[PDB]
């Protein structure tokens, strides 16, 4: 099909752009709510081996505050991404001086490339995303409260205020869908804001581990 | 003050004084004048006693009656202009305007005449010629009346337009010489729409109105100013006005402009900041859509392509497809899209050349550029890849062949492409490549490297290199090779260097900071801008 | 949830493990709250 | 406060569980002091407003002065503060109590 | 139309030689890292 997969691509791009905005990167307002029509006009509306084919809709966006912090969001065509297909991405990453990228796979990316991916983590931090997940923004669901990522200074302020070691906080594991949405690694604390029926608003903190 | 009342037979204060000067009894004469030829109703004269005896003088309700009957007449004439038959109501309003131009000289009734004249979509010739002779009558005219004035008055319309163009040029110059040097916001950062939504473009649209002739004359005036003063912002203003009018659904202006489709697709390209293969081939088909005998369309296309935004977008596209060719390892001769991008850049650059020569043709671009200059840039990029791989493998080459320097210092297209390649390697934050290509930057053909656009772009790209600006060798080489050869002569280069230093003075080494302070001291005969920048640097640094 | 013209906001799933795996840990906490409240206050009995 | 409530409590459920019964306390005061809710009262509304404002500060769940503790205290008593303001108004204290 | 000769000048020959050198270094780096 052509219209259906075009719709899938448009939805995926919208979700990715919302993700980038919530991660603190500079995303313009118009590109954050562009409808299907302008997407078709800009990219082609004929992705059945036509103009709006993948690797043409990749996006590079810089941080809001520091212009030297950018991030790529690639779009492999092969349903099963292999070691070479990510080594080309790594080389493409190396020419510029940026270290963060996102991969949107279509099917289960191969485990050997997973090991290669995790091996190069300290130099270049980059992670994958199944295209099925990105069809919906989970942070919009009614069950999901507002997650906020803390800086080091406010985490230290919190620990000093409640006189508790960081070990004693509640936990959120690194594989959590919201944790992967926010790209948060081990050792970070997330502030969670909830509406409470007995107090009105309750703020709790989760530690990534 | 009370002139023009005598024409209709209703005497004003002048004839009043003339008659009462040689009159012995003013009481009976004034009573009859306020009674006989006054309001011919028993109601008003019978109301005079009560209103007199109230203590409030009758002047008050007389003036109130005059003003409110004025307002009622104006509102009813407005309604009539939108009620009944169009031709009949227009003829009645024409009669009313003809009989009100006798009283047009009355400020208390000037609103009546002006509103009724606004009510007429097309004022006759003689009445317009009368009103435009007076400053306040001309200025109080409605938008339709001003449109009628400008439709057949070329010089006055140009005089009206000129200050707006002056404001546009002043804003553009202030933005180009902005102290705030960053990549987050620059001259080319804002979208084309908000620039078209800016006060200059929308105001020019309002003065143009819905007239094709006014829009064409504005384009011709911008073209003449751009040809004479050699300022390229007029082309940008023309393109912005055309696209704003098209987006305002002014189809009458869309069809009369032969470059409508090309300018629309180019506006799309500028909005996306990317001349993609689909849009590139669309623009190529537009370029091949020009017929023989109508080659002035080619000149208009070149002028449209002459915008700094359009030129920057086309050059960035050419450079990035050059890096794509290097990445896929394709020789320059095998890329036809590269040829199309070079042709578009050639048209954009030679807009002024072919307009001044009055030849409406594509200038010949030599094959030497493509065959020889581009492989040098690709060799530099391949050496970059080689150095990176060797860094990951178990010294960076900075030698510059004489051929590349010759082409850069002799070819304007090569000059622009090399300048933007230097910008692209600067945004990569690679000191070795900048030091390697600095000898090429030392001398450039056409002095494009010392232009305001490239000076601002280079300062913005170098702003990210504050850390590297802590090494005195790098800054000293970058200044003496490129900046110091023009800054004593060209004021713009000096201003840009001073602004970059102001933005990044903490990072400059103390010896290098002193050297830049004493070598770049303001000169007496230059502008006040350099003195202001140096004073600001001195105030902030200490 | 990814189907066209299906509300992605209010479409709960009544299954604890599926809710957890799809929407995180705070979402499964809230879902557990609502499920327990329903199973308790079904017969009219109220628990603080 | 109304805007905050309408997102805290969707579905328009007025019933809520809170520590003190304000309506019953008002009734008890009326019966103790023989208000006679027929004559005008000597209650300056500004007294009510500033009394409520001062009373809010005295009900502390999270004690402290740094911004974290102040924010936590503001949240922990948000619903009770909203309810207390919504009953001990200036108009209600003059037209209803 | 522009006259584009098919003969290779020193620029294109140098570009192709650097291409081949880069390819050799790329295969060497692939052998190094893919281990």
Curated annotation (Swiss-Prot), chain B:
N6-acetyllysine modification, residue list: 512
Keywords attached to this entry: Acetylation, Nucleus, Phosphoprotein, Repressor, RNA-binding, Transcription, Transcription regulation
One Gene Ontology molecular-function label: RNA binding
Tissues with expression: Widely expressed. Expressed in heart, brain, lung, placenta, liver, skeletal muscle, kidney and pancreas.
Chief location of this protein within or outside the cell: nucleus
Annotated localization: Nucleus
GO terms under biological process: cell population proliferation; negative regulation of stem cell differentiation; negative regulation of transcription elongation by RNA polymerase II; stem cell differentiation
GO CC annotations on file: cytoplasm; NELF complex; nucleoplasm; nucleus
Residue ranges of the TM segments: none
Classification via InterPro entries: COBRA1
Protein family: Belongs to the NELF-B family.
Function, in words: Essential component of the NELF complex, a complex that negatively regulates the elongation of transcription by RNA polymerase II. The NELF complex, which acts via an association with the DSIF complex and causes transcriptional pausing, is counteracted by the P-TEFb kinase complex. May be able to induce chromatin unfolding. Essential for early embryogenesis; plays an important role in maintaining the undifferentiated state of embryonic stem cells (ESCs) by preventing unscheduled expression of developmental genes.
Subunit (UniProt): The NELF complex is composed of NELFA, NELFB, NELFCD (isoform NELF-C or isoform NELF-D) and NELFE; the N-terminus of NELFB binds to the NELFA:NELFCD subcomplex. Binds RNA which may help to stabilize the NELF complex on nucleic acid. Interacts with the first BRCT repeat of BRCA1. Interacts with KIAA1191. Interacts with NELFE.
Protein name: Negative elongation factor B
Species annotation: Homo sapiens
UniProt gene name: NELFB
From Swiss-Prot, chain E:
Tissue specificity comment: Widely expressed. Expressed in heart, brain, lung, placenta, liver, skeletal muscle, kidney and pancreas.
Modification after translation: Phosphorylated by the P-TEFb complex at sites next to its RNA recognition motif, promoting its release from chromatin.
Highest taxon listed in the record's lineage: Eukaryota
Subcellular location: Nucleus; Chromosome
Coiled coil segments of this chain: 7-35
Function (record text): Essential component of the NELF complex, a complex that negatively regulates the elongation of transcription by RNA polymerase II. The NELF complex, which acts via an association with the DSIF complex and causes transcriptional pausing, is counteracted by the P-TEFb kinase complex. Provides the strongest RNA binding activity of the NELF complex and may initially recruit the NELF complex to RNA.
Record text on subunit structure and interactions: The NELF complex is composed of NELFA, NELFB, NELFCD (isoform NELF-C or isoform NELF-D) and NELFE. Interacts with NELFB. (Microbial infection) Binds to the HIV-1 TAR RNA which is located in the long terminal repeat (LTR) of HIV-1.
UniProt similarity note: Belongs to the RRM NELF-E family.
Record text about domains: The RRM domain interacts with RNA, and is essential for NELF complex function. It is however not required for the NELF complex formation.
Protein name as catalogued: Negative elongation factor E
Species this protein is from: Homo sapiens
Gene name tied to this protein: NELFE
